[PDB]
Symmetry: D2
Subunit: 284 residues, 4 copies
């Protein structure tokens, strides 16, 4: 997996036949290599229809999800493996090439205490199996580190790396997010450096989830590190500019993050491509 991606949430988080068409068509208009398709309600994902759309528009896909609470691997690793293998099945059915995201827990997950080794044992057992399952379907398995307010288990790149190395699977990659790194990394570039070889996927997100290039992310340090480590993965725009007000509680977002999704698609994708070119990402 290599190139420029855009998260389907730039159009919506729904994945009915209409939303799938709008996001895939739109990602094609903006000349993206990948679309990241969220898996929210697995039973309602028509993998035949989606693959038909991806093939029609010449688009590559990765899937992502957050584990629902009944499936949080911290506490319920067996339900984690079920939900993750079910999502992996939809992913491979669609022609997607990876499942990534918060594949190990929730984005509102909290015990009140620091992570315990019992919890990490649950995470590694659960992800041991689902990654093995992904292996049988030709898929790569992603682990996205998120900030301390969303999850208490994987916040820094070093924690994500440590987890990947304990699982010991050869098809798990670290997935970083500049919005989360802006809080978690002691100097955002240190996150990319720590993940180095396991880093194959980036959410390129402004500090306020608005428009990359118009916030507090130090994009020169981010692109410098990506170039210097020889990054050859996927740079996916993630912004909440198209998020409807009903999504607020699920993304902890209480006011508009930008003017509108079209301006974010225009200015943000251009910014990522222009900065990628300035730093010769993918320039072998």
């Amino acid at each position: 997996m290599q190139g420029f991606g855009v998260h389907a949430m730039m159009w919506s988080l729904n994945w009915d036949h209409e939303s799938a068409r709008r996001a895939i068509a739109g990602a094609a208009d903006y000349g993206q290599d990948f679309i990241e398709i969220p898996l929210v309600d697995l039973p309602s994902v028509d993998t035949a229809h989606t693959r038909a759309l991806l093939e029609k528009y010449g688009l590559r896909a990765a899937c992502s999800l957050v584990l629902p609470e009944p499936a949080w691997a911290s506490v319920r690793p067996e339900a984690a493996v079920a939900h993750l293998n079910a999502a992996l099945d939809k992913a491979a059915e669609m022609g997607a090439e990876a499942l990534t995201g918060v594949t190990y827990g929730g984005t509102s997950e909290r015990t009140g205490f620091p992570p315990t080794q019992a919890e990490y044992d649950n995470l590694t057992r659960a992800l041991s199996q689902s990654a093995g399952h992904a292996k049988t379907l030709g898929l790569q398995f992603g682990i996205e580190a998120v900030n301390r307010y969303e999850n208490h288990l994987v916040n820094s790149a070093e924690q994500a790396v440590a987890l990947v190395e304990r699982i010991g699977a050869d098809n798990i990659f670290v997935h970083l997010d500049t919005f989360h790194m802006n809080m978690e990394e002691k100097g955002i570039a240190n996150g990319i450096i720590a993940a180095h070889d396991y880093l194959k996927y980036m959410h390129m997100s402004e500090s306020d989830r608005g428009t990359p290039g118009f916030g507090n992310v130090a994009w020169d340090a981010v692109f410098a590190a990506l170039a210097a480590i020889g990054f050859k993965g996927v740079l996916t725009l993630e912004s909440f500019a198209a998020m409807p007000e009903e999504m607020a509680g699920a993304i902890s977002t209480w006011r508009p993050v930008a003017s509108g999704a079209d301006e974010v698609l225009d200015k943000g994708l251009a910014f990522l491509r222009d900065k990628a070119s300035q730093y010769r990402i993918f320039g072998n």
Copy 2:
């Protein structure tokens, strides 16, 4: 209120006699003008003792708090006024010059939905009451904007300004925190600019709550904005480096933020002093 401050959490969770002494003596050791004293357990505070120690060490103080959930102003405005007024009495007894912090809500407060005008009405009525009570005590009353994950009500500087103007009191100031602004402000300096009529207090906090100078906060933009708006208030260091693991849940902090309070105090207070001089913050 003007000058350099340090939050007492660099030494102490609580505020018993020996914690109060260690924090105040420590702040005095680092030449600070202000110590910020958190008020958590109001009956356990010995304000007369604190006042004597502040005077012995030549320190000025501001008090701060987060409202406990029974007193969140958005839903229980009358409980909020009762708690804030009790807090202000204790602050006044100590000789503090202001009560600030999350004086309108919690840091684990969430409704699931964006803030409603009914909630803002409750906030406006409650803070107007307690700012008034602060005014009778000779105290200023601060509103600290925090990030979206701690609270749904006052996140950006513009929201803080909007609330301060709705309240309409002359002793209320806006209090910004660079750790929160690093997420909430569309360019961190925009928060300082937005608050320029009311900004009197800063938490100078690195993006990971570690050491200022060694994270992702754009300090040149922060200090430039402070200088250009003519900032005359307090620059208070806030870091979680002394926080014990027992507090992890209260601050949503799951791993060390730095190597130790001693080097955050050494390096971070020096960094803030050195940047203030570079930008001529106090002349």
Copy 3:
């Protein structure tokens, strides 16, 4: 003088009838309020043609220059006044609203020593006279600070401010350049802050003279300072992307700065506009 500007150099430094319409039409195409028109050879400048173009395409203009060595005001103030007054005449004829740039010396000017009071007396004498001539023509007069390698007299905003203060004229403004400030200012925002009473004109130039947004200028600090001091002048794009190689020696530019002028105009003017929106420079 308010708004978004582009230096005519994005098309050509020559100002014949061909080059003039090409530049003014191009500036109009990009929705610019101002074009900055260089005055290298005053006899070659046909002001009647230029003002006609400016009016048709709805463009306003500032003129700029660098003093030729026979006219360097530090040594030959009388020759400076004569040269400056002739440029001001041509500027007024073509309907420009200001003469700015290195109006006080050269861009290869150096003495080997720090600037003396006698040189600044020469500067002040010359600029006082020509600024007054400018005032009678209804023109403002600008002083652009440049880096230590181009000139030894006016490098920092503080220096430009002090010179403007000494002259004591109402129509002289400070003109700053982000390319030069990136070297000269101890934190680029400190130059904008220092010039707050006199700053009416910016050259928004990347650190390598390339494309704003794609270099080392700290644009957040620049725009934050601009907004915070309530800047109301012109933001003019300066880039060497269209300079022919025969200009190399005159601008000490030995290799390409970007991938052609069309890309710089597209990306760079948009970037200046977007950042201005982000920091509400003009609203």
Copy 4:
């Protein structure tokens, strides 16, 4: 060659016995691994004295120079070889491990035109010979890229790398200077990345030659690039804080860059070591 260095110019660029003593003892008091010793007047350099002082204080050293104009390699390559080999002889006698700096030209060197192939042929011939001499002494040979106003031949890391690879010697390294990169590199970290193979030496220098951490150099991008390419060389502080007013013409510096060398040494070296440790530069 690895560790932290300080340029002897922080105390003097004269190298009489007392100046050498003051400089080497000074670098020792600030815990440096290296001191960078400028070679200007060769006959007044007592090498035995210097070597003894280096070993006494446990200091390692690199030498550096700028070619005098009669020996600029681009036009007078035979004279460049003669000068470089003599400087190499003195460096090895002193116990220094390398000769670096502007080893290929001047800092006021300028043809009026972009650099030519013939000029680079002269550079290749001269530097390949003198690097071959350096190898017989067991020294490495450095090429420092400087900005467009000091030299027209080696400005960007890219240019330096192309010249190093053309020569083909295994003891030539690229030497970068953040002061010069802040102008020459399209994103300062791009210069470090382009030099990755050959980068063994840095001048860590603020944008105004003042105090690192208090200017416009994007230190997080610099240290990120250095960490990510696995840099294992020397981080040498360079600042003009201690420069006497009589040096102004030689370094094109017309006003103080800082308040004093003692503050620059204290704050700047501490900034470099703190960032180095933040980005885990060494081990």
